[PDB]
Amino acid sequence: IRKGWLTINNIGIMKGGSKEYWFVLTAENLSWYKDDEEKEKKYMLSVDNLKLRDVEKGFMSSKHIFALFNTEQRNVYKDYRQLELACETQEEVDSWKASFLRAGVYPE
């Protein structure tokens, strides 16, 4: 339902460091790509069995941050941290959060 650039702050330490990925969100799944060519299909998350949260109060304010997480089903991202997603502006974060909620991501 939505396509665009989206930064991930929590990436495995072996390949860690905040990185920007091309992200496609649809009703069924979350698809991550290296670039807007939409070729790699490196990894994905299921829309169902996910929860959407705001970032911790007092956390870094250099980026507009929100996170995807879960505790009830085995649909969790790599067990390193909660999937912290970030954007340059608040509008992009709100757009992504709304798209996730429409897709079927449970709020909080």
Curated annotation (Swiss-Prot):
Transmembrane segments: none annotated. Disulfide bonds: none annotated. It is found in: Cell membrane; Membrane, Clathrin-coated pit; Cytoplasmic vesicle; Presynapse. It comes from the Eukaryota. Phosphorylated by CDK5 leading to synaptic vesicle endocytosis (SVE) activation. The dynamin-type G mediates homodimerization and plays a role in self-assembly. Catalyzes the hydrolysis of GTP and utilizes this energy to mediate vesicle scission and participates in many forms of endocytosis, such as clathrin-mediated endocytosis or synaptic vesicle endocytosis as well as rapid endocytosis (RE). Associates to the membrane, through lipid binding, and self-assembles into rings and stacks of interconnected rings through oligomerization to form a helical polymer around the vesicle membrane leading to constriction of invaginated coated pits around their necks. Belongs to the TRAFAC class dynamin-like GTPase superfamily. Dynamin/Fzo/YdjA family. This is Dynamin-1. It comes from Homo sapiens. The gene is DNM1.
